[PDB]
Chains A and B, each alone.
Chain A
């Protein structure tokens, strides 16, 4: 017999839910920056019928360079 799957593995996840950290309202005045962020965050999270329509396949890639800061 295999796993369900799965029992997963060791270590752990989550731990970022303690709150509070930072409010997003700082960029709320622009709306030029948030519009590109709003389309790149919550819509790529869960949305279905909007993709196959336009046909654009959203990438999973996020690469953060530039520190400092």
Chain B
């Protein structure tokens, strides 16, 4: 229940500053701010930054609570794939402090985020299935990954040669018409892919050709010139009559 979670979080906004010292509230509120706002899918790096803030505030607390804190923050690195904060957190002296069994499996999960590599991602997916269960939202984290990692391997196969048959190039993604080619049709809409397909003979043609340069630089200036004469029509009719 997202609205009930935010309502419980909204009541904590004035609760943290109510008493004298939290002692830890806003830091915990930051982690709670990294849940509902993360469910809102606002910004992937800022929500991951709240886990870094909570991890700075998790020092000298109960270890079972601290050993499960890396479950959320290091698996949050899985969803993002571009936090840019990878080496900052895990290679610092504060994140290397945990030698426990559960965090050692999390240390390679933080390395699994640096891995990507769908050959390896689909492999370790079974080994990390236990940590996959602790994922607060199991679908969304790996759906945005699998959907993004889809074209990651697609831009590899479509890049080398200009035109490709649509049946074999979609055979590695295992199917054509149902979703892929419709998702690939959305790529022209998202501008990530410039090309056109062929339904009858099954050959995908890529063309970046058709520029727009001289034209909009002409007609759009004439549309402005329509304001030159119309505004001068006031001068015309005023001086004459």
| Direct A–B contact in the complex, CB atoms closer than 8 angstroms | yes
CB within 8 Å of B: which residues of A? 23, 25, 28-29, 31
Chain A residues within 8 Å of B200, by CB: none
Interface CB pairs A-B, < 8 A, 12: A23-B88, A25-B52, A25-B88, A25-B92, A28-B52, A28-B53, A28-B56, A29-B53, A29-B56, A29-B57, A31-B30, A31-B53
The 10 A-B residue pairs whose C-beta atoms are closest, nearest first, are: A29-B56, A25-B88, A31-B53, A28-B52, A23-B88, A28-B56, A29-B53, A29-B57, A28-B53, A25-B92
Query: How many residues on chain B are close to A (CB under 8 Å)?
Result: 7
Number of A-B contacts (CB under 8 A): 12
Q: How far is the CB of A38 from chain B (nearest CB, A)?
A: 12
Chain A residues within 8 Å of B53, by CB: 28-29, 31
Task: Give the complex CA separation of A25 and B94 in angstroms.
Answer: 12
Q: Give the contacts of B74-93 with A (CB-CB under 8 A).
A: 88, 92
Chain B residues within 8 Å of A29, by CB: 53, 56-57
Chain B residues within 8 Å of A23, by CB: 88
Q: How far is the CB of B51 from chain A (nearest CB, A)?
A: 12
In the complex, what residue of chain B is closest to A24 when comparing beta carbons? B88
Task: Give the complex CA separation of A25 and B220 in angstroms.
Answer: 49
Q: How far is the CB of B37 from chain A (nearest CB, A)?
A: 15
